[PDB]
Amino acid sequence: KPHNVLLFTLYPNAAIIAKIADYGIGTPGFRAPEVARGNVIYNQQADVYSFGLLLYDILTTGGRIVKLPDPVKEYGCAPWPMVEKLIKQCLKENPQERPTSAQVFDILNSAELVCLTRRILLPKNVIVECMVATHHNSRNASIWLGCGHTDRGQLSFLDLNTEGYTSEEVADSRILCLALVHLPVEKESWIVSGTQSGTLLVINTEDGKKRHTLEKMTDSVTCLYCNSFSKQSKQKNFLLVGTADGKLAIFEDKTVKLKGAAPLKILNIGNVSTPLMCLSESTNSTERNVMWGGCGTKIFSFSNDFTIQKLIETRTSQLFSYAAFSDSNIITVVVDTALYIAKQNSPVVEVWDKKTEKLCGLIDCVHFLREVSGRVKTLCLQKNTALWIGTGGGHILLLDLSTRRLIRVIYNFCNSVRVMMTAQLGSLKNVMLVLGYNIQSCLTVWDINLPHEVQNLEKHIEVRKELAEKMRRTSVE
Amino acid sequence: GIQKCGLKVISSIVHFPDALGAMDSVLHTLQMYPDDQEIQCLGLSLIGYTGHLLAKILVSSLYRFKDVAEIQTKGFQTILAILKLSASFSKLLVHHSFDLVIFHQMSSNIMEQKDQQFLNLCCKCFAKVAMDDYLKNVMLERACDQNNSIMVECLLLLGADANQASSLICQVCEKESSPKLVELLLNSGSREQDVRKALTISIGKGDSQIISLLLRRLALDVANNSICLGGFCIGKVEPSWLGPLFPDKTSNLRKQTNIASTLARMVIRYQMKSAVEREYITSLDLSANELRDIDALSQKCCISVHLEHLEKLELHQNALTSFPQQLCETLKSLTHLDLHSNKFTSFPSYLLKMSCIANLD
Numbered sequence: 142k143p144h145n146v147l148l149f150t151l152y153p154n155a156a157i158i159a160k161i162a163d164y165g166i167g168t169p170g171f172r173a174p175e176v177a178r179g180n181v182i183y184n185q186q187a188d189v190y191s192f193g194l195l196l197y198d199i200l201t202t203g204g205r206i207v208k209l210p211d212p213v214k215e216y217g218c219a220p221w222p223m224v225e226k227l228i229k230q231c232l233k234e235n236p237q238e239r240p241t242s243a244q245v246f247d248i249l250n251s252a253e254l255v256c257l258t259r260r261i262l263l264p265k266n267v268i269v270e271c272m273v274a275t276h277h278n279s280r281n282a283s284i285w286l287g288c289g290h291t292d293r294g295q296l297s298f299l300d301l302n303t304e305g306y307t308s309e310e311v312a313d314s315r316i317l318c319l320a321l322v323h324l325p326v327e328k329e330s331w332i333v334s335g336t337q338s339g340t341l342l343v344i345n346t347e348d349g350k351k352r353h354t355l356e357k358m359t360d361s362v363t364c365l366y367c368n369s370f371s372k373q374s375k376q377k378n379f380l381l382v383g384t385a386d387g388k389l390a391i392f393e394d395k396t397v398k399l400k401g402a403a404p405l406k407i408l409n410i411g412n413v414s415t416p417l418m419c420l421s422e423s424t425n426s427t428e429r430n431v432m433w434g435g436c437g438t439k440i441f442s443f444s445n446d447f448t449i450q451k452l453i454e455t456r457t458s459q460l461f462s463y464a465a466f467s468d469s470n471i472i473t474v475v476v477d478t479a480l481y482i483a484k485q486n487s488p489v490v491e492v493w494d495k496k497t498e499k500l501c502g503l504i505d506c507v508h509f510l511r512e513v514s515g516r517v518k519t520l521c522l523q524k525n526t527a528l529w530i531g532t533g534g535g536h537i538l539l540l541d542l543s544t545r546r547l548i549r550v551i552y553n554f555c556n557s558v559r560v561m562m563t564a565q566l567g568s569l570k571n572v573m574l575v576l577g578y579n580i581q582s583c584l585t586v587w588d589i590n591l592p593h594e595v596q597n598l599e600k601h602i603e604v605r606k607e608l609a610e611k612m613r614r615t616s617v618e
Numbered sequence: 619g620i621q622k623c624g625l626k627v628i629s630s631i632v633h634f635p636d637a638l639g640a641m642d643s644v645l646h647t648l649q650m651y652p653d654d655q656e657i658q659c660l661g662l663s664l665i666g667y668t669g670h671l672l673a674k675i676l677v678s679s680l681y682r683f684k685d686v687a688e689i690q691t692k693g694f695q696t697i698l699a700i701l702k703l704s705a706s707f708s709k710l711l712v713h714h715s716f717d718l719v720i721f722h723q724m725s726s727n728i729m730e731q732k733d734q735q736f737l738n739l740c741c742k743c744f745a746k747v748a749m750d751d752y753l754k755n756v757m758l759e760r761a762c763d764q765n766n767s768i769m770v771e772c773l774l775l776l777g778a779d780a781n782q783a784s785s786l787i788c789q790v791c792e793k794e795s796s797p798k799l800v801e802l803l804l805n806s807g808s809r810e811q812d813v814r815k816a817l818t819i820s821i822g823k824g825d826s827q828i829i830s831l832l833l834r835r836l837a838l839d840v841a842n843n844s845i846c847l848g849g850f851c852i853g854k855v856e857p858s859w860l861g862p863l864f865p866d867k868t869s870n871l872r873k874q875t876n877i878a879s880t881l882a883r884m885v886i887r888y889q890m891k892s893a894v895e896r897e898y899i900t901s902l903d904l905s906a907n908e909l910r911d912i913d914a915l916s917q918k919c920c921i922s923v924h925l926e927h928l929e930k931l932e933l934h935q936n937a938l939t940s941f942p943q944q945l946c947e948t949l950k951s952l953t954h955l956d957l958h959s960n961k962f963t964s965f966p967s968y969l970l971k972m973s974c975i976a977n978l979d
């Protein structure tokens with residue numbers, strides 16, 4: 142029972158924190174059903190029910206203290222799901238269903254248990270590759286996921302706080318990507334999405350009836366982006382869009398407020414042969430005025446004046462690697478001291494240098510997966526020199542930029558990662574949102590400290606094992 | 619004296635096939651002539667394949683000058699050849715003097731010079747001695763005995779058990795060291811008991827810099843915004859220590875150097891190729907530190923502006939006698955103050971002057 146657990150220190154990164162003691166002085170609150178009935182013989186498995194009751198008390202913070210109900214519903218608390226799954230599994234009437242103590246320790250030794258904060262299962266519908274994040278720090282915390290099952294588009298609005306969503310077909314043609322622009326000075330928060338027919342709707346989240354259509358482009362829309370030139374500069378924000386005819390059109394965040402708004406500038410970087418796929422911003426502040434994008438087999442970097450600064454050709458990549466993989470458009474681009482490149486239907490990642498315009502390294506996800514199809518799908522990078530890799534097989538790879546080593550491989554939670562990107566919720570914390578297949582769509586929210594948590598847990602468990610072995614040997618001696 | 623021109627004739631004949639011993643002869647000459655003969659000692663090919671004196675003579679000749687461009691590259695090629703002949707050469711090599719010359723040449727501005735082939739040979743030798751990781755631990759111990767934080771990072775990155783040995787951290791902290799070195803050792807894994815012993819050591823030899831470096835690892839949790847200095851038996855307390863523990867938002871992030879990580883990356887590649895071939899701190903626990911006064915907290919060094927946002931101050935199980943009044947007015951946002959199990963004699967009435975005090979004990 143919680144009365145029989147002693148605490149030595151409150152510092153989370155400690156060798157010894159909690160201890161067990163039998164005070165020498167079962168109870169109705171925490172009686173195991175086999176023991177409560179009493180027609181049973183003591184078994185190792187009997188204590189597992191008490192341990193699960195302890196877990197429930199910890200999750201509820203002693204709410205039961207002052208057939209059990211749902212931990213989230215009965216008392217307000219963070220979901221923190223796989224522990225709830227552990228409680229459901231262990232708290233089973235059948236004794237054989239109770240996991241062994243070693244199994245409980247092993248499943249409790251997973252850092253994913255700590256990192257996984259929330260998991261949402263969208264109801265049966267077309268999976269959403271579209272994903273947006275909310276800039277609002279109030280109770281309004283939601284995403285703008287969108288799916289298309291017919292010619293006309295459709296959008297969804299799913300609030301994380303309320304765990305509910307509303308979906309309705311609003312766009313006359315399918316949506317493929319979205320962007321969000323925020324102007325708190327004018328209190329204008331707008332969401333723009335592009336039709337496969339070749340027009341765009343901008344919609345106000347404050348009033349759903351503010352729906353107006355932009356000018357038309359020749360071919361469908363590939364990607365959108367909303368660029369902020371830092372919060373300490375007087376430069377005006379711009380809505381960048383990239384189409385399939387190489388048209389890089391720029392909408393002004395104040396121009397789009399009126400119906401029938403004309404794009405101010407257009408760059409014809411590519412064509413149908415090499416359509417533009419994605420955009421990205423430089424992580425370092427030294428190149429924040431330089432914006433990069435993968436125009437098919439081309440990489441363009443342009444300054445705030447919308448003039449190209451550097452061009453890189455991907456056709457030099459197959460000289461070392463396989464030709465068929467290299468002969469494809471680049472899908473994701475990550476801009477840092479070294480460019481990280483992933484291209485369509487490829488299991489390898491290329492490293493470019495912004496100075497020499499030459500290959501600097503190769504990341505072979507095939508070998509990493511074989512260590513435990515392998516096509517990479519999406520990328521994201523953070524400040525602490527840790528890179529997250531989304532695979533087409535439903536796996537997530539963690540690497541460190543310091544050594545290009547494998548940190549952890551995450552699986553058994555989705556069938557195929559579509560998109561994955563960083564976000565901030567209403568409590569100002571930073572988390573990672575991952576969307577995968579299961580076809581059912583599953584959304585997972587991971588703690589941003591996942592690599593640090595993995596390293597800390599590994600070091601702590603190694604220290605505990607070493608101390609236990611040393612003291613056991615001392616006792617035997 | 620004729621041995622100089624004799625070695626010239628020797629260099630002429632070594633190009634002929636089947637030159638075979640002449641190794642003992644040239645070794646005696648090199649021990650006799652330090653400067654001129656060593657300039658042409660590059661002619662030493664694979665001969666004799668076990669005398670440690672020969673290897674000792676080789677390394678001592680390299681180090682005795684250590685400032686002539688050509689003999690360094692020549693001698694590095696020579697030592698590379700003989701280790702390819704026998705891997706047991708690496709053991710005796712790192713045993714006698716290998717560190718004293720290797721660290722000196724790689725830290726004497728080896729970067730920013732058009733010596734790409736030179737560095738390549740040195741990294742090839744590095745990847746060669748990187749095997750038998752016990753030797754790497756020896757290299758780490760010797761690299762910590764001296765104050766060279768430039769290469770310790772490389773040894774840690776290649777993989778070295780920093781908890782090998784009086785552990786490493788206590789040794790580094792005992793002698794006068796640099797903040798960069800102790801930081802690199804704390805960032806890599808090192809046993810908590812070793813770090814605790816190192817804190818006691820650095821308390822003895824008073825140095826605010828190393829004290830803060832350690833306390834940022836033992837007693838700081840950024841998630842909770844709390845200092846957890848509970849039970850460390852720090853007999854005193856100084857504001858110059860808790861300074862860098864508080865966020866101090868003026869500070870930023872800057873990559874001072876990257877030469878060590880790139881050096882580590884290329885030696886790893888060569889080894890692989892050779893194998894293939896706001897948010898202030900709202901708590902301050904000082905409980906059970908065997909204090910005797912906290913008078914040293916007055917117009918503190920950058921700690922005064924941070925104490926104004928403290929919302930808890932655990933001072934229990936110490937042995938105090940008063941509460942400094944200047945601290946009472948500085949702590950303008952406390953709510954939970956703990957003073958139990960101290961040694962007080964009269965209630966300081968001015969404690970009740972704090973602007974927001976709400977739980978006095």
Ligand SMILES: CNC(=O)c1cc(Oc2ccc(NC(=O)Nc3cc(C(C)(C)C)nn3-c3ccc4ncccc4c3)c(F)c2)ccn1
Pocket residue numbers: 147161162163164165166
């Ligand atoms: C603020 N700090 C405090 O309040 C505080 C208070 C504190 O008081 C104590 C608490 C517990 C114990 N004793 C035990 O826990 N014994 C024990 C452990 C186990 C385990 C190992 C199987 C759990 N089995 N048995 C155990 C062994 C034999 C028994 N025989 C008969 C009956 C019961 C028995 C129990 C004690 F001596 C003192 C200790 C530390 N801090």
